[PDB]
Amino acid sequence: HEMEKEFEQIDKSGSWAAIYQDIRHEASDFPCRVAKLPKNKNRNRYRDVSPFDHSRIKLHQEDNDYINASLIKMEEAQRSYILTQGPLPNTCGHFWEMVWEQKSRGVVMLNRVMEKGSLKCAQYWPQKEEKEMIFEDTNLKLTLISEDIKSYYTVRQLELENLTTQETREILHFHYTTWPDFGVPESPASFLNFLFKVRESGSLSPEHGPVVVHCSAGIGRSGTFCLADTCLLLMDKRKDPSSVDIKKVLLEMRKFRMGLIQTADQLRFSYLAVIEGAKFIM
Ligand SMILES: [Mg+2]
């Protein structure tokens, strides 16, 4: 591989910081007028992280249609993802309305609810079978049916019911529970095993709505997930897999949501995950 020796070169020169700065400078800037309306102030977890108007997900019920979520439609890779912030105590109803309305089958969570003793996401799913959640604003019920708890991630079977129609769906909740408190994983092996399990589930199939991916702001770890998955798809489809340019792919993604990949260490980690995943995509 070359991005393999190309990885070596960037490591060698200590230019991750510079390459990452270049991405920030080159990234698209589109308007986020709706996210910034006064009435949406309490629907944003971070004032500095907003969906662009052109790609935001719109809620369908008769109220206010806004949720901080973006559709990332990766044209060449042929896969779409919704990236969204960790829901707030007042937007869990909206979050599950989005999953229903967009026909998602999987939700991918990349943080723990509390990290370093600080809350990063509301408890937006039920931890106990007998204590289901009812979101009275959006008329949805959510029940934990089972979970498969593993050392580095947990997969939950959730039943989401539209209480208006009594229709139900099974939603798979893929929760990577072991991202470090500071920095990125030393090795991408667990992250890749996690991604491959999400893939294996069918949750990323074009038969279903886009997978919902989140972390706390929905741009950093979430960025890393969608970037690695898309690069690996492009290296599998493209006539010559060495032509896939991770910085170009990330700029393409950032036409859909700002800020994806939040640090130079995250950008390095994405490269490393894609290089290692490729060996596995053998
Ligand atoms: Mg119990």
UniProtKB/Swiss-Prot annotation:
Modified residues (Phosphotyrosine): Y20, Y66
EC numbers, comma separated: 3.1.3.48
Cross-link N,N-(cysteine-1,S-diyl)serine (Cys-Ser) per UniProt, renumbered positions: C215-S216
GO aspect biological process, one term: regulation of postsynapse assembly
Keywords: Acetylation, Endoplasmic reticulum, Hydrolase, Membrane, Oxidation, Phosphoprotein, Protein phosphatase, S-nitrosylation
Main location: endoplasmic reticulum
Highest taxon, organism lineage: Eukaryota
Sequence positions bearing Cysteine sulfinic acid (-SO2H): C215
Protein task: Tyrosine-protein phosphatase which acts as a regulator of endoplasmic reticulum unfolded protein response. Mediates dephosphorylation of EIF2AK3/PERK; inactivating the protein kinase activity of EIF2AK3/PERK. May play an important role in CKII- and p60c-src-induced signal transduction cascades. May regulate the EFNA5-EPHA3 signaling pathway which modulates cell reorganization and cell-cell repulsion. May also regulate the hepatocyte growth factor receptor signaling pathway through dephosphorylation of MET.
The protein's name: Tyrosine-protein phosphatase non-receptor type 1
Species this chain originates from: Homo sapiens (Human)
Residues of the full protein shown: 2 to 282 of 435
